[PDB]
Amino acid sequence: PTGKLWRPVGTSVATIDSLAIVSDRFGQYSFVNEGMRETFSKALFDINMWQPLFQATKTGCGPIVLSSFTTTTSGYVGATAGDALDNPVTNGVFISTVQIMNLQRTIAARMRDVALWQKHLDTAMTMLTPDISAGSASCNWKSLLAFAKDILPLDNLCLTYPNEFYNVAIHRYPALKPGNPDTKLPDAQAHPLGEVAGAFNAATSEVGSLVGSSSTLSQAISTMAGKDLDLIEADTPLPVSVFTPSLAPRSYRPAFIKPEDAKWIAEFNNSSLIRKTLTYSGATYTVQLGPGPTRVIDMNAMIDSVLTLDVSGTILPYDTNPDLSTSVPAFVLIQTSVPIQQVTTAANITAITVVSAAGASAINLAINVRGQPRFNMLHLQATFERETITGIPYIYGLGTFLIPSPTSSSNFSNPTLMDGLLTVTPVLLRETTYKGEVVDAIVPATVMANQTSEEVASALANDAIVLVSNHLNKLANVVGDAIPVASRTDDSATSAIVSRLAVQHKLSQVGQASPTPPDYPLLWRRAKRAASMFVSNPSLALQVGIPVLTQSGMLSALTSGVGTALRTGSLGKGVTDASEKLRARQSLTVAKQAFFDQIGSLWP
């Protein structure tokens, strides 16, 4: 049973309506199921432990028995009259609301009390590493004590109550074994209150540490089910939400990104220059679109973000072409009639809006750093919005210069300030971008081995690629973490892949002389580096031309392997290299024993 206890308000006959939460002057009795007593007992148990320090310091008020907050009522206990009717409990143990209040504020008040002392006990305890993980190692007690008698700073609490803290301590450190009163010798065994827990944390030499290897697994299992690593290369529309894209604002360096390497950025590849004009704040400036191709951020295929083009440390040659100086650098949109990459001359450019200029010309924004005047780090920045560009077939964001007077000097300059580190930040997660279009769902499998070397590094913050990369990256840490894809152990991961290579290379051999019986020693090893190359750089699985990894099978395969692989690790997964791991722990205890030996001499 569970929930609050109910009782037949109509008396005797208890039906699915003659019940009612048995409330009263104390609040409502909620049932205390077996396991929920484990907690409140485990919590109180950790407080009772500090008994010797509560009396010493006259705080506290006696040991806290959980049997002081409960009661022994009886009735039907459920979550609702209907279902509570199927849990007739007699003399169960319930805790009334007003009590659920004290057991709370008591464990809270006492928790402070101890939390404090417990902190002093520690700066003194750990102040001599009472924990080794291979074999033993003593340190003659006299010295030890006479030593901490020093180190411990005058405001601890282990100097005001030595054997009032010691008695608390003995129950937390199975290192300190108190000398028995009637034989005046230790005990071999150490009996700290955490008897079992402390036994099951020792780094057992057979397998690393059960508490470790156990969690590193349940931890990975969490992720595997959580983010949705499963279904990682699913071939079908998936809401961007399914990718929980967060804290995702990637930055670049356009005016370098080739147009074909990333759809969201077209260029004005035209013969001559395209000097246009525009009255901005009265003054008339001339946008240039200089000698080179001047790659500009396209506006369509640009998920309403927060574009913030930073222009700093980048050269600013106002020294040579004086034409450049005087011009306030500024991010400006450019609506063109004919599609760009077909826009020849000025009459082609519909209009030009200065979405964000920089007050003060190019001769205050400068700063000489050895001849080559740089740009004082400043951030121009628009706030592009999907629909502010409705209808408008062609429009481009360009972080240019806005020259107040074009001249012969700036005839080979080309004032694109795009060489600066632009940082787009998708401000509306629901919508992603792929191959130049804005969508609401991705098709994972499509984005695999479909980008090129740099059609990946040139991805646009929160676009399929960047999403089908953030995803693999989780799955990449589950294998990297739990599974042993980094040793000659032909693990579950590199194993799922090997079975694909076989089934694959086996049918490609079917029909024709079949002169080559499948290899296997070579297949195991080829798939080992395939699974390994993945854990290594999760990204690669997106680039066209990557051995194994990019065939449709793998990944879809890998994950579902790694999947079941985590759901069976056992507990002693740590047996892997638990030999050198062990031998390394003994190595430490031998060096730490060496320490105790000095504590033992210096302070005799």
Partner: protein
């Protein structure tokens, strides 16, 4: 370390005590008590 006597069953400077870690019993109280909503009830 001044002698106490009864407050607690053990004297610190008491006869034949012994600091001596054993890789076998890693000292530990109770920190990870579960209280999260679903798990506490």
């Amino acid at each position: 370390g001044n002698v106490q006597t009864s407050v607690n069953t053990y004297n610190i400077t008491g006869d034949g005590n012994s600091f001596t870690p054993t890789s076998d019993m890693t000292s530990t109280a109770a920190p990870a008590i579960d209280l999260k909503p679903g798990v506490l009830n």
